[model samples]
Target: SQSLYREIHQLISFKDVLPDKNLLPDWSSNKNPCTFDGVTCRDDKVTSIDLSSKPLNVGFSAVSSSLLSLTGLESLFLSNSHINGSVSGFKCSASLTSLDLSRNSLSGPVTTLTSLGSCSGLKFLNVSSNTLDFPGKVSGGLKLNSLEVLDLSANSISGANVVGWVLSDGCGELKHLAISGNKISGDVDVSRCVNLEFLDVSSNNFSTGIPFLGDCSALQHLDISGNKLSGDFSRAISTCTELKLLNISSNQFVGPIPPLPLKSLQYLSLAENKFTGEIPDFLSGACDTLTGLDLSGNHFYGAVPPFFGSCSLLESLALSSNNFSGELPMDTLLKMRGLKVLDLSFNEFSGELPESLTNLSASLLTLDLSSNNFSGPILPNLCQNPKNTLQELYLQNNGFTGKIPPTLSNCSELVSLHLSFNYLSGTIPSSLGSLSKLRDLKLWLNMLEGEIPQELMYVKTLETLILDFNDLTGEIPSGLSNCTNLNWISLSNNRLTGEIPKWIGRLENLAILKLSNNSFSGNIPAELGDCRSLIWLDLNTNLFNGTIPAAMFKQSGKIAANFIAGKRYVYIKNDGMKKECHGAGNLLEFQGIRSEQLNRLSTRNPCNITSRVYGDHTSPTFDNNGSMMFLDMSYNMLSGYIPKEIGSMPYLFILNLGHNDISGSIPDEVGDLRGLNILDLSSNKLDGRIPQAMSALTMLTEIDLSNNNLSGPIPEMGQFETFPPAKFLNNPGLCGYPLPRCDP
Candidate 1:
């Protein structure tokens, strides 16, 4: 007991660092060490010390040295305590059964565990989210016969036979293991661990197919997602009859899914695989117990099968981004009365929606059917029952027609209502203001008429309001200032007329404001500068008079384009009227457009659709100085020199000031935008040599200096030479290599 007290004083006094004063107040020489905080004693000896989540800021050696004195300790917890240094000196007590040091800065080779060979009674060990490495082969002498649970996730550990070493001789009791988010590769063989139940090896480099869990009948939960494991999944999991949850998504599994024999399976995810063919009948085996099923991002085709109705306990069903076609079987789905979430978007389903949709479960929370070909009038009684719990309803990009359902206001709990890209016609209903919980209201690309509803201001929780490409008329609602949560407001391509309201500046969260191709009149409100988060502003082709507001640039850097930043969208390339090119040439939404249907869309619409996937969805943050990214005021009737202040927008990528009556030399400062990707200054009244400073822009991929009164030698360097002669066309004295060489 005296030695134990002395060791406690040594640990707390090492390097003069101390534990949180309040956490160790009674650790004096006079008081019994057994009475100290976080110390539990049995038979007058310290048996457990749990200082987890404490700010212990001590080295591993200091704590390990102290722990050696308390040989009676059975459990130790020091997770999330700013502890650091190697564990070479960490020698656990022989009687220790549970040890947790996760979320620390601990680092060392995996062989360091060999030092714990004396801890024969160890049953649980967790060192996850650390910097520990497996730089070499695990020491052979390492053995913990009583170990049952081991978590080594989120570390630098990497090896071919790491799992083999953990399950080596005396680890038959190992039931739970997680080694995710490491560089571990090669085949894993867990055949000997007959009692293993939970195993997670996701986000690793294991490319050698499924690991053999040979005859592990007691296994229940298995997750191998985000790996390179390939081949069929059926044979690998056939023996595990008690598996309650299985996730093999984001792998290379191919061919039709074979019959699985797991009768107790409740949750299954096979998304993002190479498996083709119609939905398999094998899933029906788990129909009685399965609660969640996700088969999205696969190659499954044909109408959804009726077999899913047998999943009486199903609460969620996600089958988006597949090739499934034909009208959805509403009657078959209604059989699953307990469904809470239903996502069938981005498919080829067509035909009128069945009226049975109105009878959906009262527990339904989300219903997504976007990018399909479903036509006919939207049922107005989607929430007829008083017990309706619908929250999110997305039916965008379909062929649905007829009047906007006024009955939608009955859904008091509705949060997001997206019905864009459809042929829906008729007046915007004012009754929608009754949806007080609405956060997103997207009704773009429709034939809805009538003035903007003032009643909408009653819904103070609105965040996104997109109503573009419509026939809405009248002035910007003055009452909208009450909905201060607005982040994105896009009302472009409409017949609306009136002054752009000044109250818009009060919406501090507003990120995108696109009122382009409209009949808006009056001066550009300088108050717009107060919107500290404005990232994308497009007021093009409007009837505006007066100088461009310089105040608007104040918050330009803080603006992030809400649509393009974190959303998955495709860039469709329209066929060129001249030379061959790729991309819709304009940024367009990519809602599961297939390559085979590209040619068909080209002849059907002016915006020729071609597939060029842009999978990156990383959000761009505001630079230290804060600068705007995009600005388009083209085709307006204003006459003045281009503002040199524009040069201050260091992150501006797309600047379209073309087709304006501006007169003056192009400012050399325009070259300051080194990050500019698309610069369209064509069709403007400007006369001067293209600034030589423009040659510094290496990221410039698309430029249009055509139809401008400019005379200069085209800079024959970098992307300048890659431009087609047409981009330099209709200009005065703009001769270049692509347009015949300028006189040397």
Candidate 2:
């Protein structure tokens, strides 16, 4: 007890890495170490310790000295602990059988495996997500003859012959190996890994070849997707009969999908490739054992062949973004009573949704039929059975018309409902409030009219609400205060009136709030500063008169959008084209707003169109503290000075406050924003010399000081010299190199 407990205590108190607030309560010196959360004891000595994901932000030396030196330590798991420092001088217990230091910040060379010869009995080792420089002085080869499983995924390992070094001594006992998400290239040779059963080298830069997979008779799970591997792999994987799940998506494999005779395969994904042709006869003929299949983002055309109804056990099927046309074969598809998820988007499928959808409601979880030619009213029978199985239903960009069925309330577990860009008419049914778990509710570009139903407040999980371009009337319902999780709220181009509810600031996660081109009138609530998560705030073309509140910047460094991924959005750039039209670049989609109706927004500012931009939701600017990125309040009747609080925003990329009746000397604090990209303050009643401090903003691409009653030579530093004379026109007393010289 004395010897083992001392080491355990020493590890816990090692170099102050483990803080007291984050410690497990049971870790006390008087108590047995086995009673602690991550400690395990066999008899009197600690045999294994797993402190994975604990807040132990430490360096490698802390662990190497105390825990790794434990005589009886056979297994150790310290993954996801933010552990930093190098592992070049490695050491481990002689009897250690497994080691996992994954998802840490440790750095070292790949050749450190040679130093691990000390722990000859090690069977499993995972150093994934570390900075392991590959081809770094490979003095010898991996010497652990007993190594069975190795995971070096998401590291900096790169080289064409990494596999050769890993298997130099031989992979006689290797069962699992995952080196995915690396830059490893060239051919992979596992011809000698006879006993290997699981191998995942996906998301790498492999050029070609895994022809030796035929030798691994025990291989069951294989994922080689997201690479540049391409060649004749048909014969290579022909013998993988025992494979259960195979993902070869996002690769260069072209031509018709190779014949996979794997009878035991439960899931198969060949998405995001150049594969074409109709569904072959062999795939669904004897595929009763399959549960999931994804073949999206390919060139596969034609409708489902009638012979494809044999998959009785299939639950998920994704054929999205393909060229498949023709009406859905309901009779053929209904045979699979176990189907739960079905995606048929981005196709040319035309026809009315069947009224018999209730039959599938018992097991269906998600149904996406967007971007198709489907017409007629959305059927009401989708939720007739009320089995609470449906969670997401997408039907955007269709020709469907008529009222949104109130019967949707029966989907008690619905999370996201997308029906934008359709011809649907009528008031939004208040029955949607019954869905307590609804997170995203998008109904833009419809002809719907009526105030937002106050009953929606019951859903505490609502995070996104997009209802733009509709004929909806009345102000936002006050009942939404209960939904504190609201993140994205886009209600532009509506006829709604009334000031924004001050309670909106209570949404700590509120990110984007777009309310442009509306008739709402009143002062912007200074309480908006309470919204620490505000990212994009667009209030253009509104009737508002009040001072720009400095309090609006109170939450500058507390933004918490959580930065969701994979959500589709478009940012219209302001290219300053002579043909600039209406509003500044839109915050998102241009769905159904008619070209003749936009005025696009009657702003004194010119109509400039750059282009649409997309990406990894950095939202273009999600830097430190997740500060505000886009704030366009132009074309309003506001009268006030610009807020000095704008200076502290480190992530403010675009700020447009032009075309208002605002009058005051521009605040010098505006220059402190080093990341400011676009600044527009034209057509305002402002008068003064432009701040010399503005010379510090070298990142600005566009700036306008025209039409203001400013007087003085402009600050000729930073990017100011690059702007054209048009940007400084109409200022009578202003002169500089870009303009006429001022009198000495």
Candidate 3:
């Protein structure tokens, strides 16, 4: 009784310092301290204290042994607190049933929870989002019989044998367990928890089928996302019928999606899996009441099964990231009036949008039809009704042609609109600006011409405005600075001709500003450096001809701290070389350019640059971590020595500093790009010994050092031995395995 009073007094003292204490309950009068908000007591001793999401800004330092000694305490929920302290303050109570301490900045090894062993009744425990190292004692055994819920998610627990150690003694009564967002891997038997209801072992390395839930009838929610679980998935989850939510996203599960008797299923996500095969006609019958179905990131081919519409109650359907082909199944979807979300992106589905699709005016809130082969003009019937409530529409990455329909203005509830990567031409429809709630407007990568509609600036809620790679011309409209919600403004690869907006820096939330490849011939705005959150600021290939702005370097400093060690992006070349307007440059320079230009240039001269730059040393060395992701200095007038920074980017996958006026010996650091798949130092005046470290680039699939001054013996690298003579042609003094052995 005395200890409980002391804890209550401490809480009272803590509340006094809080600015919002007035919003709290009357802790002073405590006619019964248990009667206070978020407090529950058993026999006058605090047992369960749920102060979750209370916006608490204080630490738990005031909480002492006076409360940890409460023997009858079962659950302690104090999530989302600004609390920062060691878990050592918590002393075990023999009768404690559950302990939740998630979403706090608490730092320490999770084995600190082992102190609760005195609480023989500990059945449920959660210590997620804390900087815990080794969770639980590796040597000490876990009291498995009483544990029903064990959540140690979002921790830094790495090292081998972690999974084996956790299931060392077998979790017999563990029904709901979650060890997600950890580094735990390997196979272990979890069948002991026959009564397990929820099992989430996501974001780990649990490769090889464990097959532990063969007879787990009580299992309802099973999530194994972000893993390397290969092979058939149907066999892995066939028996779990009572499952309500099954998320196996981001795995290597191949083969057809297996049907289950999960009649009670409500949410099922199998995204990012390798499941290949046509969508089965009978699969929809397995879950009649399903509300959400995410079958994206698979290899499912053929037309979408018409039977899917049988799921009348289905509200959300994600069929993106697949190889599905054929025309839109409009007849089937027209019957599904209850569907609110539909994502059919990244497929090979062709033909025009079925006219019947316009019937989906019931409750469709989100519709993503991006990245497909669908063609023809945007249907005018889509949003003819003023009562339509479509909130999001993604129609990018298709072959769709024609102009934007003014009738789409009827979709008054629209918050996001994406129509990029299509052949859509003509001016922006002024009617679209009528949408008061419009937030995101992306219309890049199209043949659209003419001035942007000034009315679009009237969208008070506009946040992201992307209109790159089009024929858009005319001055950027003013008054956009008032759009305080603007975050990302990308207007690259357009014919835009005017001064770059200076007011762009006024938007407090602006993060990305890409204004490259435009005709904007003015000084780089100095105010842009003031944008604190600016991360990506690409202004290359523009006509802003002057000394590079000092502000630009200062802005780069803000994001340099978060510099990732690997490639941030990669460029793929399925067709071969690019030759639009290049002196011999990186692969990205020719990207999106016509293929005819490549063929025209390749016929004239082939491999010449490699001989000049890489002279004596063949192979090159790389950084321990990996190298660069970007190397797009090609086609420019840049001249000088290749910076040593190139070698430091060990994860660099592409290097294309070609066509520039660069002179100077190719730095030995160039050899450090071990992960480089493509190298294009062509068209430069570089000359030097080919660093022997180049031999380490076993992963190099393509190299283009042609058109340079001179070179030497080609590195006898693994794949390099088989490179065609064309890759080493057009260069003086270049020789080796592929090109008759050079005289040593």
The candidate that achieves the highest lDDT relative to the unseen native structure: 2
Count clashes in each candidate, considering only residues at least 3 apart in sequence or on different chains.
Answer: 10, 3, 41
Q: Write candidate 2's Cα lDDT for 258-285 as tens digits.
A: 7885588888899998898987877873
Greater-lDDT candidate between 2 and 3: 2
Query: How high is each candidate's TM-score?
Result: 0.85, 0.92, 0.70
Model 2 off-target regions past 4 Å? 1-32, 35-37, 55-65, 85-94, 136-139, 563-566, 575-580, 589-610, 613-626
**lDDT ranking, high to low:** 2, 1, 3
Alpha carbon lDDT of each predicted model: 0.77, 0.80, 0.68
TM-score sort, best first: 2, 1, 3
Global CA lDDT computed for model 1: 0.77
Error of 2 at 572 (Å): 1.5
CA displacement after TM-score superposition, residue 677 of candidate 3 (Å): 20
Positional deviation of residue 243's Cα in model 3 after best superposition, in angstroms: 2.3
RMSD to the hidden true structure, all candidates: 4.6, 3.6, 9.5
